[PDB]
Amino acid sequence: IVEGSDAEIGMSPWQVMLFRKSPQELLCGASLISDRWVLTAAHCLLYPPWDKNFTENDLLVRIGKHSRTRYERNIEKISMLEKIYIHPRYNWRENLDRDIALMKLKKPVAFSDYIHPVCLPDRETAASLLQAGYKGRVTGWGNLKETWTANVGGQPSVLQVVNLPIVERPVCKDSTRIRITDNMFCAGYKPDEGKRGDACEGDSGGPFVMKSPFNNRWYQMGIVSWGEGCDRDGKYGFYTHVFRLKKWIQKVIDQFGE
């Protein structure tokens, strides 16, 4: 996260870390949406340009973490993966269209002060909160600045958080040459808006969330998907439109129990 700040304890209890077993590194962010279902970007699991094609056994997830580095004794939890599900119409060749994937935990995780699922948006919530100018929240353990390894196959000690405004669709389109689809939205400040902030390398797959004024519940509206660099003037972060792919999500989940 660029130009964000230290998250508070338990501020984002649905935050999930995606790890490679061997060699041991942090790959992507993710989110807990039930006691056994984790949500992330498809390109975290499958991206052929970078020889990326992780199976279940390659990965484990860490839930309820705050520090990137230190072990949190009776706070954080290590979960294994039973099955990986990537959107069948996911398109990595062109624009990361439908950049979304579900991961099922081998065993259900137990909820705590630090581990708790985020809500999936319904139409009403999606209709109300998905408006330009309205702000959502992005969290992750990614880089604090854009590095030379960006968009190619320092770092915070604790979880980072930034709030960013949803951007008007035509502005998003004019900011990039990539064909954007309505399975995406983009967020971030405009050059003359003064404020700054963006997701960065390692924040991929993490949650873009918004708090409903109607029921005080946090809803995940987006997944950190792609962006040209980090926190560049005139560029914006692009996010997987969760509600527009919710039908797929539910279909996967209903066949193997939430």
Partner: peptide
Amino acid sequence: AKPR
């Protein structure tokens, strides 16, 4: 494409 282009993921960070």
